[PDB]
Write a protein that binds this DNA or RNA. Structure first.
Ligand SMILES: Nc1ccn([C@@H]2O[C@H](COP(=O)(O)OP(=O)(O)OP(=O)(O)O)[C@@H](O)[C@H]2O)c(=O)n1
Ligand SMILES: [Mg+2]
Length: 437
RNA sequence: GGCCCGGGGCGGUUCGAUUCCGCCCUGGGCCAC
């Protein structure tokens, strides 16, 4: 049951079976045919072109090569039109760099425009160095595509796969680059156990040096960090995962963990056992793309957390959840209620000028001296986290993310108790509190 | 959109703010494929 045995069973979970390969090829063929009628230059990139896509995740990436001189606007317009006329059913919903998604003979496809250059330098559009990533990988990943699939499947099952902002994990390309560096999934896992937050992995130079932050230099452009969007905590989760896997290998590390339900009744008893203040800020989900939403939910969530900590409610952790129509910012504090009074540090008895200005203030209790300096009893405007959040969110909505803020401005409410466990956030609450089972 | 570095105007809070909470101008990088 040692590693190598597990890796064999694992291959079954990550390698596409002959039937799925068929579908992808036929779609590839058809897709080329359609493209070969309109003329137009194109290059298949990504995991389908390199035969490193994960089982049950077949998505063909076609990149339309345009002349450098063309305007950004021409790019989207032509790409849009070409995308639409080439797909059975389509859908446009770019985030910054436009592109068209669709289905050809049942397979997902991504038609993306990009400028055609020589030398991946002075990139015109944000995705220009992608075709060069394909060239560089072409002759070096050949024969290790299965090692790539194991790594992707590992990260996928543990929730740190993608590099979109929702995940802030490992991109596919990053994965491929790691296979070319260490040679296999097993070696990557073995070495990643010793990675640090200053680790720099440079495949073009076959080197590993210590830097200012986790960096995986792009062979194509040594100034771009391929793991730029990999968050620190997620880097940390992978390293820990690699350690655990080596100690007690298991096919489980490649199988997705089910949301694993819990009765909102068990959740209520846990919160009571904990004795904390658990609540959420609910508002309507802005109609924007994931890559726009999450960073905003992240800011909002953080801005409120910081409010809760400087206000002494002792926040434990924060979380957030986006559903079809609403969003939720979750919080947990050790302080369900604080006194109305508190002490505010004053000047040292020494300089009377400021002592006066300090005592000149209208106060309900009369300041005192303690260890050489004046202190005053002040009165809070709120005494619970919810009251505090309600206030802050009503007045500081503009700093809670462009769209998330404007939405909280037109409406939001604070949910807690039984009425909160009925919302679709139980998974996030359990993960946030470390509930196990 | 978010994050990092920088210039310049303000508001609030404070005994006391460049130094905490925010707002308006604006320059330069990075990420998302
Ligand atoms: N953060 C990212 C995302 C994408 N890419 C470029 O876009 C390709 C990845 O496109 P994507 O479709 O997001 O993933 P795949 O690489 O195709 O792999 P998989 O579909 O299995 O996730 C990479 O090879 C690379 O050229 C990149 O450089 N950095
Ligand atoms: Mg793909």
């Amino acid at each position: 049951m040692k590693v190598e045995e597990i890796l064999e069973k694992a291959l079954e979970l990550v390698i596409p079976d002959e039937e799925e390969v068929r579908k992808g090829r036929e779609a590839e063929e058809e897709l080329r045919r359609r493209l070969d009628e309109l003329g137009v230059e194109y290059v298949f990139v990504g995991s389908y072109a390199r035969n490193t896509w994960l089982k049950g995740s077949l998505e063909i990436d076609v990149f339309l090569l345009f002349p450098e001189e063309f305007s950004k606007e021409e790019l989207r317009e032509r790409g849009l039109e070409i995308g639409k006329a080439v797909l059975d059913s389509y859908e446009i919903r770019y985030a910054e760099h436009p592109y068209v998604h669709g289905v050809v003979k049942g397979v997902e496809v991504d038609v993306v425009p990009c400028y055609k250059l020589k030398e991946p330098k002075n990139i015109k559009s944000a995705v220009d160095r992608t075709p060069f990533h394909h060239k560089w990988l072409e002759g070096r990943i050949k024969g290790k595509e299965n090692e790539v699939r194991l790594l992707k499947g590992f990260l996928k099952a543990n929730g740190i796969y993608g590099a979109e902002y929702k995940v802030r994990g490992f991109s596919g390309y990053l994965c491929e680059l790691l296979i070319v560096f260490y040679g296999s999934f097993l070696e990557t896992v073995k070495n990643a156990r010793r990675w640090t937050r200053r680790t720099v992995i440079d495949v073009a130079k076959g080197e590993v040096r210590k830097g200012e932050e986790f960096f995986v230099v792009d062979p194509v452009d040594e100034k771009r960090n391929v793991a730029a969007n990999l968050s620190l905590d997620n880097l940390a989760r992978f390293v820990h995962l690699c350690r655990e896997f080596m100690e007690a290998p298991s096919l489980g590390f490649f199988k997705p963990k089910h949301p694993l339900e819990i009765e909102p009744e068990r959740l209520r008893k846990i919160v009571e056992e904990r004795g904390t203040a658990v609540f959420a800020v609910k508002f309507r989900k802005p109609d924007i793309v994931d890559d726009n939403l999450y960073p905003q939910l992240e800011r909002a969530s953080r801005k409120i957390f910081e409010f809760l900590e400087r206000e002494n409610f002792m926040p434990l952790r924060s979380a957030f959840k986006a559903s079809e129509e609403f969003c939720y910012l979750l919080f947990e504090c050790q302080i369900k209620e604080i006194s109305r009074v508190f002490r505010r540090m004053g000047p040292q008895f020494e300089d009377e000028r400021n002592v006066k200005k300090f005592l000149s203030r209208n106060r309900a209790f009369r300041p005192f001296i303690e260890n050489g300096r004046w202190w005053a009893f002040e009165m809070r405007k709120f005494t619970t986290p919810e009251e505090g959040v309600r206030s802050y969110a009503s007045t500081h909505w503009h700093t809670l993310g462009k769209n998330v803020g404007e939405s909280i401005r037109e409406y939001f409410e604070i949910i807690s108790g039984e009425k909160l466990f009925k919302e679709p956030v139980t998974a996030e609450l359990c993960e946030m509190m470390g509930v196990k089972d």
